[PDB]
Each structure stands twice: as structure tokens, then as C-alpha cells.
Amino acid sequence: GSMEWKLFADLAEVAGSRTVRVDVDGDATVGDALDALVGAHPALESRVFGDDGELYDHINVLRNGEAAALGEATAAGDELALFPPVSGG
């Protein structure tokens, strides 16, 4: 199904977009949807994933308003969000 990522702060700046539509498999996880996002906007890759290819602990991923693990299922119509940590103390 199709779903959309909303990007904020530094991540929206790096991607050059505040909203990205992705179309993933019916059994796609949030992690699969995240890989689709990065494929569309590869500049995000260094900000989202560590050297090990794992999501950084300090990146906040939401699915429909709630904290989401990358293993969570998705559904057509989902609104996913990525928030970075703030730069200030």
C-alpha cells in the first residue's frame, strides 16, 4: 500500500522535502517503509542509519502518532514521521 513519511527539522532539510510518499508491499514493516524513504532520498542515509545499517537510537520514528518499532506492520494510508533530536542543550 501507499503511505507517507513526514520529515522535520534537520531531516526535512537534508531530504529537501517535508513529505514523501512511498509504495511498499502488503507485508511491509515500518523498517521496510523506512528503506523506501531512504531509497527515494539517499541524503537521509547517513542521518538515519549507523555504520551497522541500524536505525540510530536518537531518531524518533512514529506510525500514526505513536512510537513505532521497525518490526511493526504497516497499512495503506499510514502516516509515518521521522524526528531528529534537538541541537540545543
- Cα distances from 39 to residues 3, 33, 34, 65, in angstroms, run 15, 10, 9, 23
| x/- map, 8-47, Mg ion, by CB under 5 A | ----------------------------------------
Query: Does 51 help bind Mg ion (rule: CB under 5 A)?
Result: yes
Measured from each CB, the residue nearest to Mg ion is 51
Q: Considering the complex, state which of residue 1 and residue 59 has its C-beta at the smaller distance from Mg ion.
A: 59
Kind and range of the H or E element at 5? Answer: strand 2-7
Q: What percent of the chain is helix, strand and coil (3-state, nearest 5)?
A: 30, 30, 45
Query: Does 66 help bind Mg ion (rule: CB under 5 A)?
Result: no
Binding site for Mg ion (CB under 5 A): 51
